[PDB]
Amino acid sequence: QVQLQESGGGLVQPGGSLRLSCAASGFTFSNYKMNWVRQAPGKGLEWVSDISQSGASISYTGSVKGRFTISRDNAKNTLYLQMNSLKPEDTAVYYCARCPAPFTRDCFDVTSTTYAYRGQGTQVTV
Amino acid sequence: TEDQRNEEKAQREANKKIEKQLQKDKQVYRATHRLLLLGADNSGKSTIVKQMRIGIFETKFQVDKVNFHMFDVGGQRDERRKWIQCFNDVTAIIFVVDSSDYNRLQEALNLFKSIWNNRWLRTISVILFLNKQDLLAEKVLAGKSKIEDYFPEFARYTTPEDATPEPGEDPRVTRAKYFIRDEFLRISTASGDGRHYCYPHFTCAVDTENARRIFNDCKDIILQMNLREYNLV
Amino acid sequence: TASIAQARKLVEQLKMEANIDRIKVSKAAADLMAYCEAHAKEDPLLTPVPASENPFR
Amino acid sequence: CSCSSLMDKECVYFCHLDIIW
Amino acid sequence: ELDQLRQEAEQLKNQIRDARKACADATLSQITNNIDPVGRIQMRTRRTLRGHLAKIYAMHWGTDSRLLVSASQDGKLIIWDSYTTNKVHAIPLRSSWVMTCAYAPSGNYVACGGLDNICSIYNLKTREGNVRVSRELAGHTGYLSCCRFLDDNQIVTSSGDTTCALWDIETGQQTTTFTGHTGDVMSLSLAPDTRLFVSGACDASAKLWDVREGMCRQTFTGHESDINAICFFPNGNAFATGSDDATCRLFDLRADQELMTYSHDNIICGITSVSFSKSGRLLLAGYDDFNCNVWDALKADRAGVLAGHDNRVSCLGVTDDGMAVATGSWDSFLKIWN
Amino acid sequence: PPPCQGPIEIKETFKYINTVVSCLVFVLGIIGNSTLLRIIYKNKCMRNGPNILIASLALGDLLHIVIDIPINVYKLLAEDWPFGAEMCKLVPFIQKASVGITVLSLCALSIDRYRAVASWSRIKGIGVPKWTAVEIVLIWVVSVVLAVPEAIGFDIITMDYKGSYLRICLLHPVQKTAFMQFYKTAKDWWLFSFYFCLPLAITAFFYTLMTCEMLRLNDHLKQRREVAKTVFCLVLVFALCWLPLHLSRILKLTLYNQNDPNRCELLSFLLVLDYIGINMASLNSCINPIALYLVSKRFKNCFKS
């Protein structure tokens, strides 16, 4: 089976720092592109960060550029999302999604009402 | 015996008639061009469809004795990664994106990036149709909404020298719209091995020259494809 | 309520899936062996076939 | 090449030393 | 309350994992070590069937191994004759986009469907000497991907609306509806005993259903990406699936587990069609490298590589007598292998 | 004829000047043109109707280099025709047939390139239509038919001059029928308008219609001007290469006087152009493959491999 379990999360005042993690099992980590998705009340799913297999190309949304950073570790099979300079507007539920096709540079969906490969989510409150 | 001979003669006659009808159909099927309309709920895809008109929804128009067919797949779920493959042999794709709002510009850019880098759509060109120019100008001119909040690179951008603003226009809105176009063009030029190109345009709600734009775009794409196969630059 | 009912149906389906009387894999392998060896002689593609008998040549 | 006649030996020699075309 | 339900679901997961581990024994490869290799199965293009304009998306054979039906995005449904290489019919279509074509087991009707969200029924053995539409099944909300007849009057249809339904042609109403999936189903394959049918969706899982009771008997996992093609075994106890993960696997309902995997480290593109042979030893698959492949089902070695197409293959078919294999591809051509 | 003022001879320095040049233009010929045939033959994706028309021009170019050049190199060194007696009956025929293919094949492409540019809805599929195969057969057949007079018109006379009894392979001054007797007296003007003037007139005229269509997006604007210049680059090379060889025959048949006391000097002048003219005439059989390296990116990768 394919499972994705997130970690971290809690009530943190602005200026704090958290390090999130998602553990992936059942599939080969090294041949996929991963990302992070959040959901605020009264809002649809939004895309935040992404990273390729090796770790060369990195992109972010305009809302967070130097505040957050992403990194991966193939040997431990877990994605990491650093969190710096927290703000009240950054309150949502975080999922560690994965694109469906292997050995590809384009991936659809990710942000949809019912995707197939996504976790339950972790809650961060500011 | 003779009955078998009559049977195979009848079968051959049926083959001849079917082949003749198939040739007739092939004569017509090769003279009509197909287009795909992929957009968002806010974008006025229905509005432009109605303008050039005058489950899957079809529409017909003809310009300079060239037949044009358009399709709109607007009855499925959110997922589109599987039924988008059925348009592998379509000449062009029409993409409509809003410019007044800034919240879903990232979603639109992600859609464009996904379309531009697929294994079955890398030979198909696109026609940008940046819409809602009046709303963008009115909302930027008044204020109360900063682009830097959503895109923290506007401070380091300068207006291009090749820009040709409409003379009764404030430079700030021209700078904004050209930054918006430049982001899409930056995504376009990163990849593409000289096989497909993107044509940008500016479109408002009150427009009546949209068919000619697709006409010239299709002419350019056809000419480029024909030149490629003749080894003639 | 609807989500609770859907979750109950899913966990029930998992419950009948878990409680299924299944036979050892070796016997299934032997059965596949037996079928493959028993019906082997009748496959035109498995082994060469005389050209006269073939209606496709 | 060719010449008008074999008596004009100069043209014949020229065609002897020339290209075949 | 949903948390407690998930907790007991985890308990059931522990129970089923324990059962799966306890039911495992020595791998089938170790006992297939005693078998002998088949050899290189090479076949050539006996005939070619041109006439289509656009790409081929589906194809199905008849019951007498003589007639086959093809579908294309032009809107043409052609019935061919493999022997004489000549056509007998050409039915125009309403909606150009079609992904499925079917043949009745008694050879009197042909059905098709696509993005129009409706399935149509045609009359072949008509007394008026012209093909006409008999019924127009409607009610689905997703696009049609696969539909098959059952005996003469019932057709099982799968669609992207996360559900599969069974109809009856006489009154055109859904007798029963199945809802256990969460993705988009894409394939169907009826069992030889004509009692159960299997399905595969975009959630990397397979579901076995029963027509009368209407409940999912068992669920199979073990794939990474979405599933694209499914088939069955002549015995009716096993089936094989293909996926964009570019690996093929064989599932057994008796053991409720996985037995074999079929992959090679030099393949990147995924599977697009699967079709078993007659005896069940030769396994045929279609890839996206503008070619095909031939596999040994019992062993794992790749023995035989069909080639000749200029685009991706789309469909595969083995006839009842097992005397020919038809391959369709986006080059608008059809070939017959022997 | 009146006694000539001086002998007719060539300075020995000329022999080495032409020989050095002939070595280079030869080597670029077989190797360069065979490569263009290699890529088409190997990969089946390269196989298509537009591309096969190029192979017709490439195939006929190889015949011209192996036939026209090596024989003419020998005649400058030994000044003899010891090859054979019927062998003389074949060189003026095969060599004249290869030139007909090159001129006519150049005319076929200049028509095809206009059809696609003026086409609106046509997608040029990658394949060989049955109609394209008709053009090649017609072009090849008609060439072997229009070279008949050279095949049966030559002979070996045994004339004697300057106390030297030799043999020459020339056109017999006296013929038998009336068709070839007229062919002798008008061959010079016949070669001009059906092997140099004909290809230049129509190919140039057709290419302006194609260029006018395109010239009537910034990167694409460069492309349209780039191809327009490349189109007229190959035509100009074609005009210059064949210019001296054709003019040599004209000056022979226009200004030469049978009673000219110093006809020996003017005659010796006429050999200076013919021997070098063949070398630059063969340059057009070599220019095409380089012109494909500098234009076709797809052919550029194949050339590198």
Q: Which helix (H) or strand (E) holds B177?
A: helix B171-190
Cα–Cα dist E26/F244, whole Å? 87
Beta bridge partners of E47: E336
The tally of domains found in chain F comes to 1
When CB atoms are compared, the residue of E51, E99, E142 closest to B77 is E142
Q: Which helix (H) or strand (E) holds B180?
A: helix B171-190
Contact F117 B227 (CB under 8 A): yes
Cα–Cα dist F103/F235, whole Å? 12
Chain center to CA of E37: 27
- The pair phi, psi for residue A35, each rounded to 5°, is -160, 175
Contact B233 F295 (CB under 8 A): yes
State which CATH number among 3.30.1490.190, 3.40.50.300, 1.10.10.60, 2.40.50.140 fits the domain covering B1-229: 3.40.50.300
The range of the structural domain enclosing residue F261 comes to 12-304
Cα–Cα dist F213/E4, whole Å? 75
Contact E204 A116 (CB under 8 A): yes
Q: Is F267 on the interface with D (CB under 8 A)?
A: yes
Residue E148: both structure tokens together = 């098959």
Interface probe with B: pick from F45, F117, F132, most Cβ of B within 10 Å: F117
Other Cβ atoms less than 10 A from the Cβ of E10: the count is 12
Nearest to E109 by CA among E73, E160, E147: E147
Contact E115 B89 (CB under 8 A): no
Residue A42: both structure tokens together = 């009264």
Contact A116 E245 (CB under 8 A): no
Superfamily of domain covering C4-56: Transducin (heterotrimeric G protein), gamma chain (4.10.260.10)
Chains touching A by CB (3 or more pairs below 8 Å): B, E
List the Cα angle B78/B80/B85 in 5-degree steps: 165
When CB atoms are compared, the residue of E53, E87, E90 closest to B29 is E53
Alpha helix locations (H) across chain F? Answer: 12-42, 49-78, 91-118, 130-145, 148-153, 179-195, 197-215, 218-241, 243-254, 263-281, 284-293, 297-304
How distant is the Cα of E259 from the closest Cα of chain A, in angstroms? 16
Contact E160 B82 (CB under 8 A): yes
Residue B109: both structure tokens together = 């850019």
Residue F274: both structure tokens together = 């013919």
Nearest to F22 by CA among F275, F205, F297: F275
Q: Is B120 on the interface with A (CB under 8 A)?
A: no
**Antiparallel, parallel or unpaired: β E216-221 and E45-49:** unpaired
How distant is the Cα of A116 from the closest Cα of chain B, in angstroms? 11
List the Cα angle F2/F3/F9 in 5-degree steps: 125
List the Cα angle B193/B198/B199 in 5-degree steps: 145
Q: Which amino acid is at E132?
A: R
Cα–Cα dist B230/B226, whole Å? 7
Contacts of A2 in chain E (CB under 8 A): 204, 224
Where exactly are the structural domains of chain C?
Answer: 4-56
Nearest to F123 by CA among B90, B216, B122: B90
Q: Is A113 on the interface with B (CB under 8 A)?
A: yes
Cα–Cα dist E110/B58, whole Å? 26
Contact E90 B19 (CB under 8 A): no
For B200, E56, F121, the CA distances from B34, given in Å and listed in that order, are: 20, 18, 11
Chains touching E by CB (3 or more pairs below 8 Å): A, B, C
Contacts of C25 in chain E (CB under 8 A): 23-25, 28, 252, 255, 257, 259
The range of the structural domain enclosing residue A76 comes to 3-99
The CATH number assigned to the domain holding F106 equals 1.20.1070.10
Chain center to CA of C23: 14
Indicate whether A105 belongs to any domain.
Answer: no
Task: Please answer whether residues E262 and E247 qualify as being in contact, where contact means their C-beta atoms are separated by less than 8 angstroms.
Answer: yes
By C-alpha distance, the chain E residue nearest B56 is E116
When CB atoms are compared, the residue of C7, C26, C46 closest to E281 is C46
Contact E161 B14 (CB under 8 A): no
Cα–Cα dist E66/E45, whole Å? 17
Cα–Cα dist E316/E245, whole Å? 19
Residue E279: both structure tokens together = 């005896």
Indicate whether A106 belongs to any domain.
Answer: no
Chains touching F by CB (3 or more pairs below 8 Å): B, D
Helix-helix angle F197-215:F179-195, to 10 degrees: 30
Q: Does D touch F (3+ CB pairs < 8 Å)?
A: yes
The tally of domains found in chain A comes to 1
Cα–Cα dist F107/F114, whole Å? 12
Nearest to E89 by CA among E126, E124, E61, E133: E124
In the stretch 125-164 of chain F, residues with CB closer than 8 A to chain D read 157, 159-162
Task: Please answer whether residues F28 and F284 qualify as being in contact, where contact means their C-beta atoms are separated by less than 8 angstroms.
Answer: no
Cα–Cα dist B132/E120, whole Å? 42
Indicate whether A123 belongs to any domain.
Answer: no
Contact E226 A116 (CB under 8 A): yes
When CB atoms are compared, the residue of E23, E31, E46 closest to C56 is E46
Q: Is F75 on the interface with D (CB under 8 A)?
A: yes
Burial of B167 (0-12, 13-18, 19+ CB in 10 A): exposed
Contact A103 E268 (CB under 8 A): yes
Indicate whether F7 belongs to any domain.
Answer: no
The b/e string for E275-300 (b: 16+ C-beta within 10 A; e otherwise) is: bbbbbbbbbbbbbbebbbbbbbbbbe
Concatenating the DSSP letter of every residue in B81-94 gives TTGGGGGTT-SEEE
How distant is the Cα of B15 from the closest Cα of chain E, in angstroms? 5
Contacts of E311 in chain B (CB under 8 A): none
Contact E234 C57 (CB under 8 A): no
Task: Please answer whether residues F95 and F188 qualify as being in contact, where contact means their C-beta atoms are separated by less than 8 angstroms.
Answer: no
Alpha helix locations (H) across B30-132? Answer: 45-53, 105-116
Chains touching B by CB (3 or more pairs below 8 Å): A, E, F
Other Cβ atoms less than 10 A from the Cβ of A10: the count is 10
The b/e string for B2-33 (b: 16+ C-beta within 10 A; e otherwise) is: eeeeeeeeeeeeebeebeeebeebeeeeeeeb
Contact B117 A62 (CB under 8 A): no
Indicate whether A77 belongs to any domain.
Answer: yes
Cα–Cα dist B208/B61, whole Å? 13
**Residue owning tokens 């194949």:** F302
Nearest to E268 by CA among E247, E241, E299: E247
For chains B and E, CB pairs below 8 A equal 65
* Residue E47, C-beta contacts closer than 8 angstroms, at least 6 positions apart: C56, E82, E85, E335, E336
Contact E26 C45 (CB under 8 A): no
Q: Which helix (H) or strand (E) holds E217?
A: strand E216-221
Alpha helix locations (H) across chain E? Answer: 2-22, 28-32
* Residue F177, C-beta contacts closer than 8 angstroms, at least 6 positions apart: none
Q: Which helix (H) or strand (E) holds A24?
A: strand A18-25
The CATH number assigned to the domain holding A24 equals 2.60.40.10
Nearest to E335 by CA among E41, E90, E40, E44: E44
Contact C3 E2 (CB under 8 A): yes
When CB atoms are compared, the residue of A62, A104, A106 closest to B152 is A62
Q: Which helix (H) or strand (E) holds C25?
A: helix C25-38
When CB atoms are compared, the residue of D3, D8, D19 closest to F274 is D19
Where exactly are the structural domains of chain B?
Answer: 1-229
Q: How was this structure determined?
A: cryo-EM
Q: Under DSSP, is residue B160 helix (H, G, I), strand (E, B) or coil? A: coil
Q: Which amino acid is at F87?
A: M
**Residue owning tokens 């990195």:** A58
Residue B165: both structure tokens together = 């603003």
Contact F10 D17 (CB under 8 A): yes
* Residue A75, C-beta contacts closer than 8 angstroms, at least 6 positions apart: none
Indicate whether A124 belongs to any domain.
Answer: no
Using only C-alpha atoms, chain E has a radius of gyration, in whole angstroms, of 20
- Would you state the torsion angle of the CA atoms of residues F237, F243, F246, F247, taken in this order, to the nearest 10 degrees? 180
Listed resolution, Å: 3.3
Q: Does B touch C (3+ CB pairs < 8 Å)?
A: no
> Domains in chain E, start-ordered, CATH in brackets?
2-337 (2.130.10.10)
Interface probe with B: pick from A59, A64, A85, A108, most Cβ of B within 10 Å: A108
Contact B56 E89 (CB under 8 A): no
* Residue C54, C-beta contacts closer than 8 angstroms, at least 6 positions apart: C44, E323, E338
Chains touching D by CB (3 or more pairs below 8 Å): F
Q: Is F16 on the interface with D (CB under 8 A)?
A: no
Q: Is F258 on the interface with D (CB under 8 A)?
A: yes
Indicate whether A95 belongs to any domain.
Answer: yes
| Biggest distance spanned by C-alpha atoms of chain A | 41
Contact B22 E143 (CB under 8 A): no
Indicate whether F173 belongs to any domain.
Answer: yes
Indicate whether F2 belongs to any domain.
Answer: no
Contact C36 E277 (CB under 8 A): no
Contact A108 B151 (CB under 8 A): no
Other Cβ atoms less than 10 A from the Cβ of A59: the count is 14
For chains B and F, CB pairs below 8 A equal 59
